[PDB]
Amino acid sequence: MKNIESLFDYSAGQFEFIDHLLTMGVGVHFAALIFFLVVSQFVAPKYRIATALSCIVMVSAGLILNSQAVMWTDAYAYVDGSYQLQDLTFSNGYRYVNWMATIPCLLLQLLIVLNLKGKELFSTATWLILAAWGMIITGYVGQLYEVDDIAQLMIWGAVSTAFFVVMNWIVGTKIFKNRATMLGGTDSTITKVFWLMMFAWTLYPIAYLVPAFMNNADGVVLRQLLFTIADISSKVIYGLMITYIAIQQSAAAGYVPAQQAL
Ligand SMILES: CCCCCCCC/C=C\CCCCCCCC(=O)OC[C@H](O)CO
Ligand SMILES: CCCCCCCC/C=C\CCCCCCCC(=O)OC[C@H](O)CO
Ligand SMILES: CCCCCCCC/C=C\CCCCCCCC(=O)OC[C@H](O)CO
Ligand SMILES: *C\C=C(C)/C=C/C=C(C)/C=C/C1=C(C)CCCC1(C)C
Ligand SMILES: CCCCCCCC/C=C\CCCCCCCC(=O)O
Ligand SMILES: CCCCCCCC/C=C\CCCCCCCC(=O)O
Ligand SMILES: [Cl-]
């Protein structure tokens, strides 16, 4: 009852559209999990953990979209021509707790294909995960108030975006200082991966703000549409490119399974 979803009745079309976005989301992630599984054999040992983390992200994200889709259909019932709330079982908080695990996985695979290792891998990962967790936690607290205190949503949103800015400055500094280490021509590819990250990750703040500029049932639909665009791009497309870089660098490094697959 702390999220705006609880404030509205939905038409069958709005409800069915939301249910379809979530179920379609589950399908995409599990279908890509198999891709990442099958291509791990074509990735050198040095980079294989990068594709394994993609598998982890797929299942983690797929289970939570699956969970949301079922919570969505348990929470509402078609009564008198509309879908009305029946039980307190749907909430976007589940997305936030899940980012605590999936965002580190997405960051760690980027550092691995950057060829960071040892001391600098450990320290860089620690500061990035610490900052990402401060982004998520302050964001989590803030969205508890999207119904009751929109001013406090904005202030937690401002504290969260400060970690977001610092976190991306670390990522960008590491990519642009290490892109000359990369092989197979992937110095060019990693930069686009960074701009794709910038685009897809920034959609989550927009969805976070929907309650402020569109607190209605159509805003609920839009927010889930934006999560779905962002999920597919920050997890699946991003994963495909990370796996591409991993196999190309494997091939340029003398890994024959990688050379034959390409
Ligand atoms: C009373 C209210 C309390 C407010 C508290 C202030 C808000 C904290 C925000 C930023 C601090 C973190 C910024 C400094 C951390 C930099 C990370 C770093 O040094 O690592 C970079 C390096 O590239 C890796 O190898
Ligand atoms: C509460 C509101 C806070 C206001 C927030 C507005 C300020 C954001 C500014 C820039 C975006 C951050 C960009 C971070 C990623 C790019 C930086 C980078 O890559 O730096 C390269 C390095 O300098 C070369 O080696
Ligand atoms: C609706 C189902 C969606 C499910 C999604 C299924 C995932 C595969 C999709 C596109 C692959 C084309 C992009 C190519 C990715 C490049 C990575 C690479 O290195 O290619 C591996 C090659 O196949 C080794 O022989
Ligand atoms: C599933 C993958 C990712 C990378 C999810 C990323 C989410 C964010 C970058 C969220 C950022 C937020 C900010 C910057 C401030 C408002 C609260 C948010 C947590 C949504
Ligand atoms: C304080 C909370 C965060 C704790 C630190 C988390 C960062 C973990 C550091 C990196 C772990 C990566 C290990 C993978 C090594 C790859 C093996 C290989 O080269 O094949
Ligand atoms: C997620 C990104 C956050 C961006 C920072 C937001 C900056 C704050 C913007 C202007 C604040 C205006 C004050 C509005 C008061 C709202 C309380 C009310 O409803 O009366
Ligand atoms: Cl997730």
Side-chain angles (χ1 to χ4, degrees):
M1 301 183 186
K2 272 156 183 58
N3 295 330
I4 65 171
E5 284 83 2
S6 60
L7 290 165
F8 315 109
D9 308 307
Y10 305 88
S11 64
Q14 289 168 333
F15 188 88
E16 272 165 325
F17 180 75
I18 283 165
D19 188 57
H20 289 335
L21 283 168
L22 295 166
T23 59
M24 188 259 264
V26 171
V28 171
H29 285 79
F30 278 97
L33 165 66
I34 306 288
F35 180 81
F36 295 117
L37 178 63
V38 174
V39 303
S40 47
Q41 64 184 295
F42 302 124
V43 186
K46 190 192 314 183
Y47 298 127
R48 204 175 297 153
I49 178 174
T51 62
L53 289 160
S54 267
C55 294
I56 291 184
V57 169
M58 296 308 97
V59 178
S60 182
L63 289 180
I64 283 286
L65 297 183
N66 196 69
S67 168
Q68 296 282 107
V70 180
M71 293 175 172
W72 188 242
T73 56
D74 282 350
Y76 293 92
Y78 195 82
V79 186
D80 292 338
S82 70
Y83 277 96
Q84 306 184 1
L85 186 77
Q86 303 294 132
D87 193 313
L88 185 284
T89 77
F90 184 81
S91 165
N92 300 280
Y94 298 94
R95 285 185 186 270
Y96 282 73
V97 185
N98 201 75
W99 296 338
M100 296 290 289
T102 62
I103 288 182
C105 292
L106 294 170
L107 293 161
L108 183 48
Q109 74 189 149
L110 177 64
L111 309 176
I112 285 168
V113 303
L114 266 186
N115 301 315
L116 308 187
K117 284 138 60 174
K119 169 192 138 298
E120 191 191 4
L121 169 59
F122 300 150
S123 61
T124 300
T126 298
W127 286 108
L128 284 163
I129 292 168
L130 287 180
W133 280 353
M135 193 198 326
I136 303 161
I137 292 168
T138 60
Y140 179 82
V141 170
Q143 60 82 55
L144 294 172
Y145 298 101
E146 69 188 41
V147 163
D148 296 314
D149 192 354
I150 283 299
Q152 220 193 127
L153 175 91
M154 303 309 272
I155 298 174
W156 290 108
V159 176
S160 176
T161 303
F163 292 92
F164 183 62
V165 161
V166 164
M167 187 215 74
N168 290 122
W169 171 79
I170 299 178
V171 173
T173 302
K174 295 302 218 188
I175 291 174
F176 279 100
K177 292 189 72 203
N178 289 274
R179 60 197 255 255
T181 78
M182 301 180 74
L183 316 175
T186 62
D187 53 306
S188 174
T189 313
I190 199 79
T191 292
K192 294 87 167 186
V193 174
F194 177 67
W195 286 108
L196 181 67
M197 293 181 50
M198 298 282 263
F199 165 78
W201 288 39
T202 299
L203 298 161
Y204 292 105
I206 295 165
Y208 170 91
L209 298 172
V210 158
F213 64 86
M214 199 185 298
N215 188 12
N216 51 52
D218 292 332
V220 166
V221 179
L222 175 61
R223 167 147 79 183
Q224 294 294 329
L225 182 60
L226 295 176
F227 282 153
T228 302
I229 293 157
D231 288 354
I232 290 160
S233 302
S234 70
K235 294 159 172 34
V236 182
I237 294 181
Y238 174 90
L240 283 164
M241 312 190 89
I242 292 297
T243 283
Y244 169 75
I245 294 174
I247 300 161
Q248 186 79 329
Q249 282 196 123
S250 305
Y255 195 64
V256 177
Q259 305 192 340
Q260 265 188 314
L262 288 159

